[PDB]
Ligand binder design. Structure first.
Ligand SMILES: OC[C@H]1O[C@@H](O[C@H]2[C@H](O)[C@H](O)[C@H](O[C@H]3[C@H](O)[C@H](O)[C@H](O)O[C@@H]3CO)O[C@@H]2CO)[C@@H](O)[C@@H](O)[C@@H]1O
Ligand SMILES: C[As](C)(=O)[O-]
Length: 451
């Protein structure tokens, strides 16, 4: 019995969460983004060749992907293709990866619905326009639906659902993405993540997803800051950390070891998994990147040297798009030899070293009851116009749900919308939801503001 966000996950899925946690401290799986769809020594990709495979002799233990594929921006996705065809290619690649014997992970550099721009376009107030009751909520819904398609298409020839570690809205601590810190409060972010998990799990029925959350990096091991964004235990399976450096300095390494041992502790206390979700030399290790001396081994040495910092399930460096930008060395790059040294290290696990990750027999503890106010989210500013207060109570049968706007200015009696939320009209500081549930009385409080 293990704690998994989706209490109804498939056998293999639960098996993976079980594997990923047991592996911590024993060996770290090396992952590579677009490892068989983007290469420099492979030639035209097709989902079977990989630069890692060509320089190290084995595929990474983890294959990384991104929703950009569906968008048609990252192969095998193609601009021409309809999203429905790209989804088919993505699933095919996910199949070949699993066939190779690897573990699949997926990130989402979601397009800026509001402006038509990319994830790097941080204008349009897209974060808030996408949240429950948002002016572009439907767009996000539509996007998540395509993600549900992908979840379902990811099956073995026997029809068995391939487990996928979903890592949505990453690095929100920074502001280089429209869903970052400068565009929403910790609370607004949380509702964004939570609605994501609930829509896919509860509304779409996905059952082969382990949800991952990684705010960023460079926390100096500060639990407080790190967690400020945490969606909460009933929404996260994997606690991540994203950190790139290009100095190999001891200072860098010290900080990295601090963040790694932190997430590891939080993970242990919470009975969840922790991993180095993203890592690598800044700007890559190619033409436009940098070749810090023995960077790869210096980092491994740093990770192993610490008993706690090493209790992280995997570490994935980024894509090998081209010469200027690629994170895994190829003939000609200075770090090529060091990266091989790192691969040959007994502590780094690769595809062929992965065994007993899906055939395990584990039970998912019962989903824990939870209740949050989807709107208005915590730390959000409320408009004078009438708005709908929506509460979500999960993991138990709800008899009733009440809300109290204090400052007590109002008292609302909510009603289930038959699909996800308990709602009610509110024509405007403290919104407190109380739900009389089968698991007892659950209450929650969001704090907002008028204009
Ligand atoms: O423009 C045509 C060119 O597009 C390439 O694919 C792009 C992606 O569409 C996307 O822009 C991606 O963004 C990267 C970003 O550059 C950086 O690496 C960041 O760390 O991660 C994001 C996404 O993971 O960059 C790639 C390539 O740079 C590809 O389809 C080319 O074949 C095509 O000609
Ligand atoms: C490589 As990135 C933009 O996901 O940190």
């Amino acid at each position: 019995t293990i704690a998994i966000v989706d209490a109804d996950a498939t056998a293999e899925t639960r098996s993976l969460l079980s594997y990923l946690d047991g592996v911590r401290g024993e060996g770290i799986l090396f992952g590579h983004q677009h490892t068989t769809s983007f290469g420099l020594t492979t030639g035209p990709t097709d989902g079977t060749t990989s630069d890692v495979k060509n320089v190290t002799g084995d595929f990474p233990a983890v294959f990384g992907w991104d929703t950009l594929i569906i968008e048609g921006n990252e192969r095998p996705g193609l601009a021409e293709n309809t999203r429905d065809e790209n989804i088919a290619l993505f699933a095919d690649y996910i199949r070949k990866a699993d066939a190779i014997g690897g573990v699949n992970t997926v990130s989402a550099h979601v397009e800026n619905f509001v402006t038509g721009g990319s994830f790097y376009d941080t204008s349009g107030d897209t974060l808030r326009a996408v949240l429950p009751g948002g002016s572009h909520h439907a767009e996000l819904v539509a996007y998540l639906d395509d993600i549900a398609e992908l979840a379902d298409a990811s099956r073995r020839d026997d029809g068995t659902l391939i487990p996928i570690v979903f890592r949505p809205w990453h690095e929100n601590a920074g502001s280089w993405f429209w869903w970052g810190a400068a565009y929403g409060s910790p609370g607004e972010y949380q509702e964004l993540y939570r609605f994501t998990v609930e829509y896919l799990r509860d509304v779409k029925g996905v059952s082969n997803f382990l949800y991952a959350w990684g705010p960023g990096g460079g926390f100096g091991g500060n639990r407080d800051v790190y967690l400020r964004t945490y969606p909460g235990d009933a929404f996260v399976d994997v606690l991540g950390l994203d950190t790139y450096d290009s100095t190999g300095s001891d200072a860098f390494l010290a900080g990295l070891v601090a963040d790694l041992r932190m997430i590891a502790e939080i993970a242990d206390e919470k009975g969840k998994v922790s991993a180095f979700t993203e890592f690598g030399v800044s700007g890559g290790v190619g033409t436009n990147g940098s070749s810090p001396a023995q960077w790869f081994t210096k980092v491994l040495a740093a990770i192993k040297a610490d008993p706690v910092a090493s209790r992280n399930a995997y570490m994935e460096t980024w894509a090998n798009f081209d010469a200027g930008q690629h994170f895994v060395p190829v003939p000609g790059d200075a770090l090529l030899e060091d990266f091989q040294a790192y691969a040959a290290d007994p502590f780094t696990l690769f595809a062929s070293e992965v065994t007993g990750a899906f055939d395990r027999t584990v039970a998912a503890a019962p989903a824990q009851p939870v209740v949050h106010i989807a709107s208005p989210a915590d730390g959000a500013r409320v408009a004078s116009a009438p708005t709908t207060v929506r509460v979500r109570v999960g993991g138990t049968d709800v008899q009733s749900v009440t809300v109290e706007v204090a400052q007590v200015v109002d008292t609302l009696d909510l009603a289930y919308d038959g699909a996800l939320w308990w709602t009610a009209p509110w024509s405007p500081y403290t919104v407190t939801a109380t739900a009389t549930t089968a698991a007892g009385t659950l209450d929650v409080t969001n704090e907002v503001a008028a204009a």
